[PDB]
From a paper:
pmcCytochrome c oxidase (CcO), a terminal enzyme of the respiratory chain, catalyzes oxygen (O2) reduction coupled with the proton pump, generating a proton-motive force across the membrane. Mammalian CcO consists of three mitochondrial DNA–coded core subunits (subunits I, II, and III) and at least 10 nuclear DNA–coded peripheral subunits. The electrons from cytochrome c are transferred through CuA in subunit II and heme a in subunit I to the O2 reduction site, which consists of heme a3 and CuB. Cytochrome c oxidase (CcO) catalyzes oxygen (O2) reduction at the heme a3–CuB site in the transmembrane region of the enzyme. It has been proposed that the hydrophobic channel that connects the transmembrane surface of subunit III through subunit I to the heme a3–CuB site is the O2 transfer pathway.
To identify CO2- and N2O-binding sites, we treated dimeric CcO crystals with CO2 or N2O in both the fully reduced and the aerobic fully oxidized states. The electron density of CO2 or N2O at site 2 was remarkably strong and little changed in the aerobic and anaerobic conditions. These results indicated that the affinity for CO2 and N2O at site 2 was higher than that of O2, N2, and water molecules. The hydrophobic interactions that sandwiched the ligand between Phe67I and Phe68I may affect the stability of ligands at site 2. In addition to the hydrophobic interactions, hydrogen bonds between CO2 or N2O and the hydroxyl group of Ser108I, and between CO2 or N2O and Wat2 may stabilize the binding of CO2 and N2O. Under an N2O atmosphere, the activity of isolated CcO was partially and reversibly reduced. Although the binding of CO2 or N2O to site 2 does not block the O2 channel, it may inhibit the diffusion of gas molecules through the putative CO2 channel.
Author numbering:
A (entry chain F): 3 to 93
B (entry chain C): 4 to 261
C (entry chain L): 3 to 46
D (entry chain H): 11 to 85
E (entry chain G): 12 to 83
F (entry chain B): 1 to 227
G (entry chain A): 1 to 513
H (entry chain M): 1 to 40
Write the structure that this text describes.
Amino acid sequence: GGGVPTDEEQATGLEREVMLAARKGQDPYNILAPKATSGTKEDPNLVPSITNKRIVGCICEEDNSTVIWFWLHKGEAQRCPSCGTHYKLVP
Amino acid sequence: QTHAYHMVNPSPWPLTGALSALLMTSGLTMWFHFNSMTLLMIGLTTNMLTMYQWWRDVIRESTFQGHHTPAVQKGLRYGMILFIISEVLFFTGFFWAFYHSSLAPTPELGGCWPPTGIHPLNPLEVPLLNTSVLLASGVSITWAHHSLMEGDRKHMLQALFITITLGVYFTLLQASEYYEAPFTISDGVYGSTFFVATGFHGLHVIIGSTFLIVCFFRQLKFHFTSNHHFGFEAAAWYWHFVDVVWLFLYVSIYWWGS
Amino acid sequence: YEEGPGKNIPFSVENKWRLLAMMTLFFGSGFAAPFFIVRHQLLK
Amino acid sequence: YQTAPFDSRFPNQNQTRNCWQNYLDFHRCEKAMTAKGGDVSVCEWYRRVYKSLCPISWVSTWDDRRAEGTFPGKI
Amino acid sequence: GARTWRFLTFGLALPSVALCTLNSWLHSGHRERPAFIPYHHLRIRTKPFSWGDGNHTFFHNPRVNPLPTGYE
Amino acid sequence: MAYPMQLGFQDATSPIMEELLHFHDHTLMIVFLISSLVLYIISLMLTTKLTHTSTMDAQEVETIWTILPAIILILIALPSLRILYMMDEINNPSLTVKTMGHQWYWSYEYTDYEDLSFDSYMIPTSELKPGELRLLEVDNRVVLPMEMTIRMLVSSEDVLHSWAVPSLGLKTDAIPGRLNQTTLMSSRPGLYYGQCSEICGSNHSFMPIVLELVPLKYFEKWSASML
Amino acid sequence: MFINRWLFSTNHKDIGTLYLLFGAWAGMVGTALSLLIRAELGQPGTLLGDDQIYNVVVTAHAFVMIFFMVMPIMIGGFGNWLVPLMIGAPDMAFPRMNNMSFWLLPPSFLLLLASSMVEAGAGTGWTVYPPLAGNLAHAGASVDLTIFSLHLAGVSSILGAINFITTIINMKPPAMSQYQTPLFVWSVMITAVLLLLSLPVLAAGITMLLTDRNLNTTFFDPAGGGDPILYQHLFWFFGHPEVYILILPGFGMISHIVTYYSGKKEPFGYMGMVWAMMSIGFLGFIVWAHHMFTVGMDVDTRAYFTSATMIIAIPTGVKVFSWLATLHGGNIKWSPAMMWALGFIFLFTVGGLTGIVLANSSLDIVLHDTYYVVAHFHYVLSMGAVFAIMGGFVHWFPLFSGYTLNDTWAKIHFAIMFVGVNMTFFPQHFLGLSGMPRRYSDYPDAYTMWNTISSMGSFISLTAVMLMVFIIWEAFASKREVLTVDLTTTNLEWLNGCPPPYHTFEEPTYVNL
Amino acid sequence: ITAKPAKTPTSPKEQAIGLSVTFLSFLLPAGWVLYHLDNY
Amino acid sequence: FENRVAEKQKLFQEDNGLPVHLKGGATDNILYRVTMTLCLGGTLYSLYCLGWASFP
Ligand code: HEA
Ligand code: HEA
Ligand SMILES: CCCCC/C=C\C/C=C/C/C=C\C/C=C\CCCC(=O)O[C@H](COC(=O)CCCCCCCCCCCCCCCCC)COP(=O)(O)OCCN
Ligand SMILES: CCCCCC/C=C\CCCCCCCCCC(=O)O[C@H](COC(=O)CCCCCCCCCCCCCCC)COP(=O)(O)OC[C@@H](O)CO
Ligand SMILES: CCCCCC/C=C\CCCCCCCCCC(=O)O[C@H](COC(=O)CCCCCCCCCCCCCCC)COP(=O)(O)OC[C@@H](O)CO
Ligand SMILES: CCCCCCCCCCO[C@@H]1O[C@H](CO)[C@@H](O[C@H]2O[C@H](CO)[C@@H](O)[C@H](O)[C@H]2O)[C@H](O)[C@H]1O
Ligand SMILES: CCCCCCCCCCO[C@@H]1O[C@H](CO)[C@@H](O[C@H]2O[C@H](CO)[C@@H](O)[C@H](O)[C@H]2O)[C@H](O)[C@H]1O
Ligand SMILES: CCCCCCCCCCO[C@@H]1O[C@H](CO)[C@@H](O[C@H]2O[C@H](CO)[C@@H](O)[C@H](O)[C@H]2O)[C@H](O)[C@H]1O
Ligand SMILES: C[C@H](CCC(=O)O)[C@H]1CC[C@H]2[C@@H]3[C@H](O)C[C@@H]4C[C@H](O)CC[C@]4(C)[C@H]3C[C@H](O)[C@]12C
Ligand code: CUA
Ligand code: NA
Ligand SMILES: [Zn+2]
């Protein structure tokens, strides 16, 4: 006894784009928290953007209540002004 | 946008809703004091038009346009939970009124509960039937839910139809008990607590039955998937809330208060 | 929609004297209302 | 008798039930005494206490309701 | 599963409704209305009702609901 | 009654009002000290060019900030609750008087022995006798025996009122269908004034209370003369 | 375009703007009402009429200041503008429902002004106690229009509370825990929980009053076995939480302003400040009967309500001391917003302490329904809630508008208001101790000096309100455009510029774990 | 905060006009009502 | 019945700039005009009713 559509058959618009991206392990709509690198100049945190700048929030140490916010610009890696952690924009 | 949230198209329904509230309140004032129903009937009409178009647009945005990502659905889940909590606290005020009056009956009542000259309904007659009906509807709506998750269109429809039929049965039984009751809303605090508490509950049963009927027609139109059906979950949560309020009324007003 | 200073508001700030008139009418009507309601109650 | 003494059944600021109970007790005792044709003077304590505690308008309203047949307490 | 909740719907829930419907059916029929007594805590009228002649409750039943002055 | 430029409580006429004055003195000292300490610490934080803007550890100091206030509240609660229970204590009154609130006057009933009742209305401003107080005098005062425990019972026959006599520490709400009890004991003869203390409509400002405290023998003859 | 933008909004900033305009207009109404009160009391005798016209003015004063000025400005205005920006969210969870929360308020306000125009008004007090508020002592439409006003404001705030709780729980960056959200965001979430739980109980109570008035119910009428004191319990079950609703967002704004103008990256003792606000919110539900110490409740009940009420001083003290510890070591900027916030810390403390005096049932016998209560609540509302609103307004006006205020004028405004509110309310302590009742149009002659001084104070506060309108005009008239804002690294709401674009965070913030 | 100089400077005379007009908009209507109370 | 959701998805995603409350076609405009006319007319009538009730 069937007759109920599935998300695979009937999901549309952004719901479907999220569904199809997650099957491929991709996160274009920023649903997941990114995992930090070591954050050195050699191994900077890689920050995707669809433009040439994005706001970073840096939780410098685990369980800090204070988030440090700054614009990251296309070009050379920038550093969190509190902890010095490196971030690089990947547009 | 590279987030998952819904930027809603500019909408007139918030304003029409706000104005329908002005027309219903000013309309009730005009009915209670100036002997006229005109404003009130305009407000009830605009309120129904607003609800229809607003929830229609929510279906357009979700089923037809795909804006209900998991993040959006999670927000609607919280919204409906919070709305149900607010309705619980509303009923809590009426239960407080009931216990206040009944635990310390004043001399005007004869210093007893039920008051002198009050002949309560037998809780083992229609009130017990109404209890069986709402509990039964809690079982059938659960059947409907599992049918939908298992992808069974025919059994979802049959279970949901049974659930609506029981909600209608309860409403007709309560209408008949209202008509047959030898006491009225003007029979002191007994009538006051009985009719206002059971009356708001009856209104919630009608609202919940309307929501289930909306889910029934959306199901007929294939709107729900086996995994995405928040309107059905929300109607089911609301329907359990209505059942649980009934169980508290039955125990408090009908049984303990008899 | 227009963005930026003086454009994210439902009133115009293009002319400071027209703005003074609009603000005068807006805050002035709020402040006046209770005096005129009291006058209304006293005149019944 | 000066006034109604402290009654441990009614120890709080709300004395409504104290007035009510003593009014009931007087009228129940009076009915029991008029019935067997006994003496209403055994009822005197209840009479003094309710007269001390109860507002005149309450007693007046209750007496009117006993005569009307609309008094809601059991006598 | 759906199968179990259907089993409960038809095997327990609707049989209960059927039995309570029987119970109510058997105890229906008009019981005899009590002597009218004009108790002041009942048939309250502080303001006329906004319908009818102002003196009838909304679901007034002439058989069992006396007015302030008694049964109609 | 209050006098011009008064800062504090009317002088105590009853032992419980005396107790409330001493309890208020103790509480006010605490309010003064905490208000003063906060203002002084604000002014201390704001009067140095020295800086320290790095993260500050909170937990040690939060012990002081919670314990010291907890101790201070206990030092208020102890005498507060001793007085609460002292007013509630069983006392054996010699006399019961009822007052009924009305729009806009008080009625009094003394029904221990005879049916004595009367209405008590404000003296209009234009009818004051020389030396009498605007908005405070009544035609018929509540005559009571001094140095005797009196049970006052308070109700209303219309809307809420509240029967208050500040110098005796008294305020009891007047609620229709309810009989509220308080006790009154005046250490002194004299005239003790109060004012309706629940919003009750057009003349809420204009239904005062005047107690007249006299020796028992005078109260008895007055009672007899008022039947 | 104009209708689509301002009547059909789904934008958190524009809706915040609508709330601030609405609240500003409401503040002018509430100010006029406050001056009529003080004009009546400014010399012995009768100015306007008897207690009915007077108490219509007093009642409307309270409803307007609470429901149309403070709640719309703090929650609807600052909450809608700042909450999404402070969590990097693109809007509220329910951007269309948000617009209905706003548009319910003009009609709510219209019903209150209708109450005052029909018959003789609702001269009930803002508590609307029966039987004075009943259909015998207040026959006709006035009280029903007041009830309906409260119903619409109730629905507005309930739907607003659902919106804020959902937004704050569901729409933060996925790496951001609740313990990485700013204190203002916490203050709004807790306020929203209080609204969600308290307003439905008010709705139930005023609905019972509506049915007693119009459908011959007797919830509050002893003739039917009802009890006027039941209404008081239902009202105050809402009413005590309501005062915490009025101050909590003010606490949140004070934390931000003190941190900012101390040159600090963070408030002292963040988790203590979260603990304190949650504690105050919880304790605020179990104390309501401190509004009922004279109604005749049992001694043990009075003992419980005394004790439970005093407990609130502990978490409140942690916040006051944490604000002082935030100032400690700061590079202090003596901005106008900092002046408001420092006035807040001191004057809120004084009103909180007179509240602890009132918490003592035995002393409350003599202080209840006197100007001592009026002094307590105007210290916490007219010098607490209002100082936090004025501080927040001057601090964030350049974010909202893209223009600067004249700081010298803003300091003048602060100085005048500071003198006027203290001159108004400090002497009311003396009137309370010495026994002057509440809701009086006239007083025994002994109370004349302090009533005279209080009324003179009210006129100074009027001068400050008039100057404030001029100061806002001068800012829009001059058009000084914002360039740089300091401390954006710990104040995300500023990082999109002044004003921010209509759409912010279309691309969300990057926050890693 | 830093800001640009005023795009449309408000001179002392212009400020006196704005302040005067603001104050009159509060004071004249209330003053008219209170002056006429006796007549009401 | 048959599943015609795909045909409603095409209609409501059509690139025509209409807001969702008008995107169904001419019937939406009619029901919008009826709603807003009753609301605005009703509100003007409520103001007339206040004017009337404001005097004895
Ligand atoms: C913003 C509004 C607001 C706030 C926050 C408060 C906060 C408090 N209020 Fe108040 N209150 C009102 C608004 C408010 N109130 C209103 C409007 C009324 C009248 C209602 C009506 O009848 O119309 C009223 C009435 C009212 C009454 C009833 C009085 C009566 O009618 O007889 C009482 C009784 O306890 C009370 C107490 C308190 C207390 C204990 C607090 C506490 O939350 C205060 C806590 C703060 C502090 C104590 C200061 C800071 C602490 C320290 C520096 C630490 C050290 C302190 C100690 C050791 C004591 N208030
Ligand atoms: C928020 C609440 C609040 C505020 C701010 C005030 C402010 C004032 N109040 Fe009142 N008042 C109450 C709430 C408030 N009040 C309540 C609840 C009662 C009890 C009612 C009852 O008994 O039923 C009361 C009662 C009351 C009485 C007692 C009446 C009586 O018992 O007979 C008096 C007497 O003087 C008084 C006076 C004033 C004065 C002179 C001010 C002045 O300080 C006001 C000065 C002006 C302002 C403070 C500006 C306000 C405007 C803004 C902040 C807009 C800002 C604009 C932008 C940000 C763009 N009020
Ligand atoms: C089968 C159950 C379904 C209920 C449907 C019945 C009627 C219409 C609306 C119902 C809404 C529910 C509650 C409102 C209050 C009262 C009605 C109680 C239920 C009822 O219907 O009670 C009847 C009385 O109705 C009366 O007065 C009727 C009065 C009609 C006008 C109601 C006034 C509206 C009140 C305003 C509501 C405010 C909402 C608050 C929102 C909260 C916002 C924060 C009982 O009849 P009776 O003849 O006295 O006794 C029987 C004797 N044979
Ligand atoms: C005679 C009585 C008159 C009184 C007036 C009230 C009368 C009737 C109201 C009945 C309520 C009907 C509500 C219909 C909602 C339909 C829209 C809907 O259900 O929308 C759903 C979202 O839920 C959502 O918004 C959830 C939205 C929930 C709202 C429900 C609220 C109950 C409302 C009560 C309102 C008044 C109560 C006050 C009483 C005092 C859409 O998402 P999905 O379902 O996942 O679909 C998408 C999938 O297809 C993708 O594959
Ligand atoms: C005396 C008479 C006074 C009565 C006054 C009546 C007042 C106003 C008239 C109301 C008109 C209602 C019109 C329909 C409103 C539907 C709201 C709704 O359903 O809101 C939803 C959110 O609330 C949610 O879910 C969960 C919440 C749904 C709430 C539905 C409406 C409730 C209105 C009454 C509530 C009273 C509370 C009773 C308890 C005291 C959707 O949010 P949107 O922002 O639209 O969309 C977001 C998009 O992503 C969707 O695709
Ligand atoms: C789309 C908008 C265009 C249409 C506008 C709406 C026109 C409606 C006008 C009719 O007015 C009505 O007239 C009735 C009688 O004149 C009233 O009943 C009243 O009088 C009845 C009998 O006369 C009583 O039975 C009722 O209790 C009582 O409310 C009724 O209330 C009132 O509404
Ligand atoms: C609480 C807020 C209010 C605080 C006090 C307000 C201060 C008063 C501002 C001036 O108000 C005006 O005063 C005039 C008198 O000075 C009035 O003219 C009246 O008196 C004039 C002189 O007798 C006549 O020429 C006019 O016709 C006559 O209307 C005029 O109407 C009124 O607007
Ligand atoms: C989209 C636009 C919105 C539509 C606005 C419609 C406005 C026109 C409504 C007609 O007005 C009516 O006038 C009747 C006068 O004939 C009133 O009758 C009522 O009042 C009468 C007055 O005598 C009484 O006979 C009765 O109470 C009753 O019939 C009734 O109150 C009122 O409705
Ligand atoms: C024939 C039709 C098919 C639905 C479909 O697959 O499109 C069936 C499936 C389930 C049926 C419904 C359910 O069986 C429950 C109801 C049973 C009643 O006997 C008729 C109405 C009733 C409400 C049915 C109407 C209709 O015949 C439905 C909707
Ligand atoms: Cu009687 Cu106030
Ligand atoms: Na006066
Ligand atoms: Zn960092």
